[PDB]
Amino acid sequence: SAPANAVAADDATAIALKYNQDATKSERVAAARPGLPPEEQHCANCQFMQADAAGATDEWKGCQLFPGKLINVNGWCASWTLKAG
Ligand code: SF4
What we know:
monomer; alpha+beta; High-Potential Iron-Sulfur Protein, Chain A; 2 helices; globular; binds iron/sulfur cluster; electron transfer (iron-sulfur protein)
């Protein structure tokens, strides 16, 4: 069900980013980045999400910091930045 080009939790990029699909387990609540309450924070409302990304699907879109691979919209990383436009 996850794409082959899913971001791996153990990607070097993901380790650096502290990317996690499991937004409940995610450091987001601990980190409490400014923008919107941690519970709201995920790739879904991240400035850097790329839903245009080739091979994007239901729960699975791109992220600027994760080219070629797809993050899960539900997930979060330390770089999470509030959806502008
Ligand atoms: S930058 Fe945003 S979209 Fe990308 S992985 Fe982090 S939280 Fe998700």
